[PDB]
Target: Putative N-acetylneuraminate lyase
Amino acid sequence: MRNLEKYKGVIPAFYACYDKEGNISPEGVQGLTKYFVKKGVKGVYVNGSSGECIYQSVEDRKIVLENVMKVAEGKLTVIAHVACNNTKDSQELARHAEGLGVDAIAAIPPIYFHLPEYAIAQYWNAISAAAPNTDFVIYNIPQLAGVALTQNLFVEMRKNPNVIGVANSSMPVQDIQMFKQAAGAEYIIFNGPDEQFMSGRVIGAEGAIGGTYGAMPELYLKLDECINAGKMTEARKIQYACNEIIYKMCSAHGNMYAVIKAILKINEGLELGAVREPLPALVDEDMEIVKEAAQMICDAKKKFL
Amino acid sequence: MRNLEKYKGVIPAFYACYDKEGNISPEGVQGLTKYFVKKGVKGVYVNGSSGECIYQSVEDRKIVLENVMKVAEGKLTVIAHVACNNTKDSQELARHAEGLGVDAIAAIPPIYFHLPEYAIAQYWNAISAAAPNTDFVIYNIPQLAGVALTQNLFVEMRKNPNVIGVANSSMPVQDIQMFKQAAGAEYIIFNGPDEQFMSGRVIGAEGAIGGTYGAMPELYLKLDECINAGKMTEARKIQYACNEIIYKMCSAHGNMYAVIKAILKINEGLELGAVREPLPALVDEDMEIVKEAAQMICDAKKKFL
Amino acid sequence: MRNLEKYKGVIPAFYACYDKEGNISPEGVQGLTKYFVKKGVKGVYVNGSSGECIYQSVEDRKIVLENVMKVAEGKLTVIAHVACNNTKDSQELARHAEGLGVDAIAAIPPIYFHLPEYAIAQYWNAISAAAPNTDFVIYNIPQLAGVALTQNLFVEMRKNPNVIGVANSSMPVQDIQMFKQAAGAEYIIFNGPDEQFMSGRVIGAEGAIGGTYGAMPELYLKLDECINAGKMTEARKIQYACNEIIYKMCSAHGNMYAVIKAILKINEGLELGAVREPLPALVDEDMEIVKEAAQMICDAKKKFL
Amino acid sequence: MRNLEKYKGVIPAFYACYDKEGNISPEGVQGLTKYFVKKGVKGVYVNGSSGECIYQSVEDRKIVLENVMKVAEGKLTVIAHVACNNTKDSQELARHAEGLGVDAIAAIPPIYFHLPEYAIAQYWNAISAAAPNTDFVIYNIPQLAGVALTQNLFVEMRKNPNVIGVANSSMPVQDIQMFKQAAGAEYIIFNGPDEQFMSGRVIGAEGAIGGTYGAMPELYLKLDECINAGKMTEARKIQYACNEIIYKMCSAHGNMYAVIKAILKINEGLELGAVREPLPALVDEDMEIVKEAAQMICDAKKKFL
Ligand SMILES: [Mg+2]
Ligand SMILES: [Mg+2]
Ligand SMILES: [Mg+2]
Ligand SMILES: [Mg+2]
Model:
């Protein structure tokens, strides 16, 4: 009965867009937003870790979301990741995001220290209470956060009526299946590991949020079309092509998001700036990998679209 | 164009069948083998860890395989897991299995100590050399063995022409995708995590070896039929029903395989005996869980077949 | 040989001192600094994770360090932990700390994302270059940061002449031994795990930085006196009493640092405020644990001093 | 109060002694036993993983212990590690060991599968009941077994009056401290990680069982003498020399125990045979490392004895 159709489809993570001085670029943010509208994705996931949120200030993240919403509002579903190291910064971003009329806010767990489940629930509920009219997505990423969304913690969080589901970036597709089986029809699970897109989708994730989607959004849209059509052979071919490109982008000395920003300059003429330190920048030796990955994306689009 | 069709389908792990004194029961083994023939599964995976191989002697494992082959030969594909703690016992079982005409032998890595990749390759190659006319399957289970089949170790093992692929029991379906992508069309990957059957299958596992399949083989056959037909909604319904049964069986005090042997007595009149210590036996309180799981299996068969 | 005597001894982690509104309290910070001067510890480790640095702004951390330096009167070795999520905030705190004439700056690795060793070295070297006249301590805490100071990364970092050594919070005392053996006499290793103080000290840590020291600094000073005298029976008595107190403080619902601030109100009349969310606050049921731990500290001081 | 003085001191792990055909050598076992008597160690720990027990049959392990007991002449404390993959083989070895009058039997936990604590306790108690008049040592090695001796499981095991303590090979010396603090004076903790010998000893391990001791037993006896005298600087020098030798021995292609057997041929003229496959054998390139480590041991003995 709760309507979650606006979340069903391909929702790329929005990248950090910087100017030449390394500050957030309003023009760069608007340009990348126009790119996502033109590519016909379902939505954008803004100021996630793929958007370098770990490395941004509250003010940086407000400027990014304001500039996304100037272009995207009414055209894309917008999920704003608002978690910060502390609760008060997270509440400030939640209130700001509700003020702009985002569809949902999201939060990773507390990081660095491994906090008990009651403290994790308190953090998410405090963030949710700052945006009390806004859908809330839990982002499960135990490999990086150091704590997991357990089945017991998910039961506790489903007591909050704003919680709509889970963006799952743990590696077991079993976790998707268990969260969806426990929660039932009024919740959505998003597939987080792009390399497993087709496998998380078939086992019950009806949404998909990914850090590599922005490099090749047409391929993930075509993958999703094949899955919805039961064309599993064609879906596998596209998944394998996407994964080969991911492995190529991850083979660079510079960070994978540095590779993606360079690819989008080659393939689209988009200027997204550098990646923020401490993420490592590309070196000269990486430009052959960038060029190869960019061409692999063009070749896969020609093969599959 | 190596022909691996005989490995493509549902291959249950064969359970340990004991008499009342706790020794291997030839009659019990033949009974369980006739059951798998009657259920029309593709093959059986014999003396794996689901068959309590960690807890069996070389002589025990010879008696099991002899009694399986008496019923199964020419009816079922037979894969004999031959790995033991040391190399010489593994070579003895490999030679014995080739002497009986199994389709393939299989091996987990060395366990307990974490041995370097060259020592892992030497162990597998020594086992393969003792069955030099027999297909060889690597069993990847890093969570239990403590070492993984890495992409570099798989490159080295593909130099052995008898290696036909990998039974993958790591949790990431990404591992299935990467092994299949690296190896190509002349290799098969088997899905190991039963809870992820449909997800591993769609991303490129053309076989499936599972410890829970013997409790409910018709449900996994029906799941596989749905997947091959592109009927992903029906596949998901069956996967969810199978996983609910697995979670019920795992809720007991006694070991999951003790629950399955008790279910097979209720549902099929099969007498497989106890589980071998140190695996924990059922307690009286577990029989309500056994009865509930057995009824769940009957109800799923009535719903889905 | 480089003189590191000012770092040898007991250097408590400095706690976050808040007012009733949860902001940094200048008067609270000065109070806690004068407490450490009167207890005769060697120094203080300021704005570490035990000081809630994860949860503090750059401005918060500047206010803390300014108020320490205002009242320390040169009586304390001051190590200022300056690592932030991003490099530019870390460089800002490094420059600020050198401007106040701290003895050393310190840095955990980059967190959340697992960055390659060249990126970790670039982060530390960038922070060090912002305080180019200041001693630099690497803080190794792989359990929380998700990356380790490896032997190869330590070789690279010893190329920077400002690096004086490692605060080691990994659990193996082998790591202390290996870092000390590799580096030699011109470097200092600080023991991080308070529960292993005597064990890390004897195997080559000549310094000690600890989150629990501020609850009971006289006990750690007396432990260190026993170790330096070769009085290992007396040292073990104190270590066991300290560890029992730590286990009692960690038994609370509220965060261990919340327990310590409540203990310091009982035993010292110090008002340090709460802990910052998301760290969980004490509940009513915890005050029995707080009072028991406070009494255990008083009784240990009567037994051992 | 239970007298555990016979367990306090240096107890080397006894190596596997093979003939040229790779079977257990009765003459080789007697020779290595007489070597340990000559070197004046407190005892031997027989058929542990350093003795290649994972790779031995029940019959192999009986032959080893028979030949130790034949020539020890009451001069050594004998701890017989009797754990096997299954319970019945473990019970057979426990009964055999009690029949020879060993001082203690020992057991690692169940391996490969991760069994619940009640199943671990059942395994140890079944082994102990087969040697009901014999002291029992729990061997904690979570890194290899995949399960830990938790504080709760140790409480349960202290209900068995034959349990005398724990050989602790987990890396935190905190685990030694917590086991000793819980158990008190009628129990002994043995330090397992040889690289941490002096640190485990000072925090409350009164015994020490080590796989590298047999390469250089005089150095560990001299280390223990320095610790008992409170001479921590002299102790640290010996610990560092021992650790440098361990790191050299572990730098070979062949397994560390293969390097130690080759060193004992050079330094002592002992013939212990190969290591059992799958442990990797030395290659020609390793003989320079063997000779260097053998010389390092001679040089350390000249410096410290
Ligand atoms: Mg990177
Ligand atoms: Mg069990
Ligand atoms: Mg806490
Ligand atoms: Mg080795």
Q: What stands out?
A: Residues A 255, 280; C 115-116, 119 surround magnesium ion (ligand 1) (CB under 6 Å). Residues 1-305 of chain D form one domain. The first helix of chain D runs from residue 26 to 39.
